[PDB]
Amino acid sequence: SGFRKMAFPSGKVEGCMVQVTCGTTTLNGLWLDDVVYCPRHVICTSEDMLNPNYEDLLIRKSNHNFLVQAGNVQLRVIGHSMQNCVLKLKVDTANPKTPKYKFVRIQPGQTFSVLACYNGSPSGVYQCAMRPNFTIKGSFLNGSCGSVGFNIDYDCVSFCYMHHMELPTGVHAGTDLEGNFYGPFVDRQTAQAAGTDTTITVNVLAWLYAAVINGDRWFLNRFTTTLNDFNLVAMKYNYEPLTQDHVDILGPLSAQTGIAVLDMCASLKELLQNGMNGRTILGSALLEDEFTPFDVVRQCSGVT
Amino acid sequence: SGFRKMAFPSGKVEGCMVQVTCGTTTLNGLWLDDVVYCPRHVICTSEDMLNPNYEDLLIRKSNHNFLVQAGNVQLRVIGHSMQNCVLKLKVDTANPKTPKYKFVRIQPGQTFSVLACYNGSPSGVYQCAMRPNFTIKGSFLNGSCGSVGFNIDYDCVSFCYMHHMELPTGVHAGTDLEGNFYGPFVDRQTAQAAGTDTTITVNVLAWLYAAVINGDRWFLNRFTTTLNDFNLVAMKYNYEPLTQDHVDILGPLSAQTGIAVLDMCASLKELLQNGMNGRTILGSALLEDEFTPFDVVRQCSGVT
Ligand SMILES: O=C(Nc1cncc2ccccc12)[C@@H]1CCOc2ccc(Cl)cc21
Ligand SMILES: O=C(Nc1cncc2ccccc12)[C@@H]1CCOc2ccc(Cl)cc21
């Protein structure tokens, strides 16, 4: 029992982290096989970031300008290329610690673990969600660029995020491992609208099921609702509309607790309309949306 | 910017996890050098747990009865001994992945990372605090026993906790790596009073400083207080009395923000007396006590 904001064990990713320096800029890189992946803004000075022409900036750089260090050992760079907003530095040595891996583009509302790094060294790991507006509320300081987000299924690390930028609002933006930004963001020091965010309804419902499994049941009521009625309330409270696909994903948790999804929706409706009344659910005084139904089943079943 | 419940990178600890089986019971062990550490209740059947005489139960066991497996490879056990509530299984091979390590007994109110494991395999990592009542609010299922808590300072892992038991109340109890329980707990299936818990005042103040550093300042007021006045309020709200040692530990955060510790105490006093009024601090609708002043400075400075 107990329910925590649990991250995946970071060991497989720690073995991939390297430092990349270009000129006066240093950030993190991800070394998989014989390629080092890093944010393309490593080639920029602070002045270049206002309106960078990355193609022109990269032309002034050669293999020997990218200093890649894995721990205390230097890697020899034999090729470089830009793919969207990432640089791919071909090295002469395959990382002996490369785990089984995949590059995936996650959907908004899904979760992942972040291994925050500085100078190629891991500092910490935390779990988070990709917001419906394609930002992440991470914990990142200057030098954290190139730190990655990932999920692990048995021995396979699915890399989904590479950190690039902190918006003036304090939220974070980044790319998939092919260098494509999540959201409308561009790698430039210019104010950028993140756009309206919403609460991940399916995740709040998953977390209410986690609460029931772990003993917190005070919010269960004698009511039910329909998808249409629930969605009128979701609209009012800036929650994502619940769909039958979301109900279907919640099936395993509904079977485990015996609480029909629409009955749990009615509990969520009452909580949205009345608040918590000074009470807590799983140690939180607000409705948590950073656990997917898969996360709840995994944490409550002990998948390794 | 951003502030998360960040755990230490778990890689160094992942390399130490093994499975230990004795008879029909399987749990996790920690392999450091040529010794495997695990909870002594591995020698018990479910029936034995009501009132176990561990000395007698261990006498019926020989080296060959403890099956230790690191991944898919079996370790040869050449010695066994009980130290308090842990078993130390001497193996013929030193763990090649042993990090630099220390065994430490943490104080109540300090924090640490937990690598939850099942069958010697890591499932997740999370951060938590040792409660003032010596319990931890973890996330542990059956088979998680032997999972460890730790802190990391550069290359040294300081192991502080080994998981042993879940109390009927859903909270967790365990030992230091010398097998001494934190708190009054005994390794027996008997109802056990955890005793009154309190809120870790110095940690809430540290987290309020983290909030100010990360932009959340709405709770700052025009007031100040004294240690005596603040402690009258702390008494009423079941908070630990604040001492000059706590004020001294908060020095670095007071210097970083320019907010005197007693002025931050007055903000905490107002929050305790008035509540949050539907507002949030660092994404939380309650006062967080699981970040120490050291955690706040580390996370806000990027120590690797
Ligand atoms: O955001 C950036 N770095 C950081 C990333 N995450 C957390 C940070 C916290 C504090 C300071 C810097 C942080 C860089 C520097 C600013 O100009 C830009 C503009 C665009 C891009 Cl892609 C990156 C950057
Ligand atoms: O608590 C124990 N195991 C667990 C530990 N953590 C989370 C659990 C969640 C669900 C079921 C078991 C869990 C064992 C089994 C019960 O009897 C005892 C009594 C004493 C001791 Cl030291 C251990 C144990």
Side-chain angles (χ1 to χ4, degrees):
Chain A
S1 79
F3 204 72
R4 284 278 184 178
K5 193 85 54 107
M6 184 181 287
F8 285 104
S10 62
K12 290 165 179 284
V13 182
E14 287 171 56
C16 305
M17 303 308 304
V18 298
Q19 176 186 82
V20 176
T21 299
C22 189
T24 69
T25 308
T26 293
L27 46 59
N28 304 287
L30 185 66
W31 182 27
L32 294 167
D33 301 323
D34 60 349
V35 178
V36 174
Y37 301 85
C38 75
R40 71 180 180 163
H41 74 256
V42 74
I43 76 185
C44 303
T45 67
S46 285
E47 176 145 29
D48 286 330
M49 292 310 302
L50 305 178
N51 190 32
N53 184 312
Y54 283 95
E55 284 78 10
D56 288 353
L57 285 174
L58 191 53
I59 285 167
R60 285 128 62 165
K61 302 299 181 176
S62 294
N63 289 337
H64 73 263
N65 292 136
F66 299 98
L67 303 173
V68 181
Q69 193 178 325
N72 193 76
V73 186
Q74 210 68 26
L75 300 183
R76 186 175 300 277
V77 178
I78 62 174
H80 66 275
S81 65
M82 183 160 63
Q83 176 177 17
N84 301 310
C85 300
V86 297
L87 295 190
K88 296 191 284 196
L89 306 178
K90 196 199 179 177
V91 292
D92 75 353
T93 303
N95 186 357
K97 295 185 198 168
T98 305
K100 277 181 191 180
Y101 76 96
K102 276 180 198 184
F103 287 166
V104 314
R105 188 159 171 98
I106 62 156
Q107 295 291 310
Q110 295 297 118
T111 58
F112 60 93
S113 297
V114 171
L115 178 68
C117 297
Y118 297 90
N119 306 113
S121 297
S123 52
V125 62
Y126 56 88
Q127 187 78 356
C128 69
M130 171 67 61
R131 298 311 312 169
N133 71 355
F134 291 109
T135 59
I136 67 168
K137 302 177 174 169
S139 172
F140 290 118
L141 302 176
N142 183 49
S144 66
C145 308
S147 298
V148 301
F150 58 93
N151 282 270
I152 307 176
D153 181 354
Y154 174 47
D155 59 353
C156 189
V157 178
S158 284
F159 290 101
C160 58
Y161 179 80
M162 170 166 282
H163 186 49
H164 286 243
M165 178 177 67
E166 183 171 277
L167 295 165
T169 65
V171 305
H172 305 109
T175 71
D176 54 28
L177 273 294
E178 298 196 345
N180 301 108
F181 265 93
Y182 285 100
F185 309 109
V186 289
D187 47 356
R188 273 173 238 145
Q189 187 178 127
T190 201
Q192 297 175 48
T196 314
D197 199 31
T198 64
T199 301
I200 310 149
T201 311
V202 71
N203 286 7
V204 177
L205 291 161
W207 168 87
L208 289 179
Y209 276 111
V212 171
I213 288 166
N214 291 277
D216 289 7
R217 322 168 52 104
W218 65 265
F219 53 84
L220 298 180
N221 60 40
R222 306 168 164 275
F223 315 143
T224 199
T225 183
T226 66
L227 273 188
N228 294 147
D229 179 63
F230 179 76
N231 286 337
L232 291 181
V233 181
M235 174 77 61
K236 177 168 155 98
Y237 289 91
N238 197 10
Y239 266 60
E240 268 267 358
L242 196 75
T243 69
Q244 184 59 48
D245 287 355
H246 295 146
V247 175
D248 286 353
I249 292 282
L250 286 165
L253 291 170
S254 183
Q256 197 166 336
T257 63
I259 299 162
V261 177
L262 292 171
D263 288 9
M264 191 64 85
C265 292
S267 277
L268 178 54
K269 167 177 168 191
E270 290 310 297
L271 284 163
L272 289 170
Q273 290 175 347
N274 317 332
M276 317 263 294
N277 282 113
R279 306 215 79 89
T280 63
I281 300 168
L282 291 181
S284 182
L286 54 78
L287 301 164
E288 295 285 321
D289 79 341
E290 292 198 304
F291 298 99
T292 71
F294 193 63
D295 297 338
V296 173
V297 171
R298 184 197 295 109
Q299 173 157 187
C300 299
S301 80
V303 169
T304 65
Chain B
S1 79
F3 204 72
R4 284 278 184 178
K5 193 85 54 107
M6 184 181 287
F8 285 104
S10 62
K12 290 165 179 284
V13 182
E14 287 171 56
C16 305
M17 303 308 304
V18 298
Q19 176 186 82
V20 176
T21 299
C22 189
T24 69
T25 308
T26 293
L27 46 59
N28 304 287
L30 185 66
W31 182 27
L32 294 167
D33 301 323
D34 60 349
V35 178
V36 174
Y37 301 85
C38 75
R40 71 180 180 163
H41 74 256
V42 74
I43 76 185
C44 303
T45 67
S46 285
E47 176 145 29
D48 286 330
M49 292 310 302
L50 305 178
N51 190 32
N53 184 312
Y54 283 95
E55 284 78 10
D56 288 353
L57 285 174
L58 191 53
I59 285 167
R60 285 128 62 165
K61 302 299 181 176
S62 294
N63 289 337
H64 73 263
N65 292 136
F66 299 98
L67 303 173
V68 181
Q69 193 178 325
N72 193 76
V73 186
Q74 210 68 26
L75 300 183
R76 186 175 300 277
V77 178
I78 62 174
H80 66 275
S81 65
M82 183 160 63
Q83 176 177 17
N84 301 310
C85 300
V86 297
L87 295 190
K88 296 191 284 196
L89 306 178
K90 196 199 179 177
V91 292
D92 75 353
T93 303
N95 186 357
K97 295 185 198 168
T98 305
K100 277 181 191 180
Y101 76 96
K102 276 180 198 184
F103 287 166
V104 314
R105 188 159 171 98
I106 62 156
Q107 295 291 310
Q110 295 297 118
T111 58
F112 60 93
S113 297
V114 171
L115 178 68
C117 297
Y118 297 90
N119 306 113
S121 297
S123 52
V125 62
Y126 56 88
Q127 187 78 356
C128 69
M130 171 67 61
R131 298 311 312 169
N133 71 355
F134 291 109
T135 59
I136 67 168
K137 302 177 174 169
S139 172
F140 290 118
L141 302 176
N142 183 49
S144 66
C145 308
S147 298
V148 301
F150 58 93
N151 282 270
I152 307 176
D153 181 354
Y154 174 47
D155 59 353
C156 189
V157 178
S158 284
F159 290 101
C160 58
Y161 179 80
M162 170 166 282
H163 186 49
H164 286 243
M165 178 177 67
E166 183 171 277
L167 295 165
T169 65
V171 305
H172 305 109
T175 71
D176 54 28
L177 273 294
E178 298 196 345
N180 301 108
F181 265 93
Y182 285 100
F185 309 109
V186 289
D187 47 356
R188 273 173 238 145
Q189 187 178 127
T190 201
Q192 297 175 48
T196 314
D197 199 31
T198 64
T199 301
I200 310 149
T201 311
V202 71
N203 286 7
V204 177
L205 291 161
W207 168 87
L208 289 179
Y209 276 111
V212 171
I213 288 166
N214 291 277
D216 289 7
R217 322 168 52 104
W218 65 265
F219 53 84
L220 298 180
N221 60 40
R222 306 168 164 275
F223 315 143
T224 199
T225 183
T226 66
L227 273 188
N228 294 147
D229 179 63
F230 179 76
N231 286 337
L232 291 181
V233 181
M235 174 77 61
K236 177 168 155 98
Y237 289 91
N238 197 10
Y239 266 60
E240 268 267 358
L242 196 75
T243 69
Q244 184 59 48
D245 287 355
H246 295 146
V247 175
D248 286 353
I249 292 282
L250 286 165
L253 291 170
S254 183
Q256 197 166 336
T257 63
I259 299 162
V261 177
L262 292 171
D263 288 9
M264 191 64 85
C265 292
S267 277
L268 178 54
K269 167 177 168 191
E270 290 310 297
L271 284 163
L272 289 170
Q273 290 175 347
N274 317 332
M276 317 263 294
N277 282 113
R279 306 215 79 89
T280 63
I281 300 168
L282 291 181
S284 182
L286 54 78
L287 301 164
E288 295 285 321
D289 79 341
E290 292 198 304
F291 298 99
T292 71
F294 193 63
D295 297 338
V296 173
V297 171
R298 184 197 295 109
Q299 173 157 187
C300 299
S301 80
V303 169
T304 65

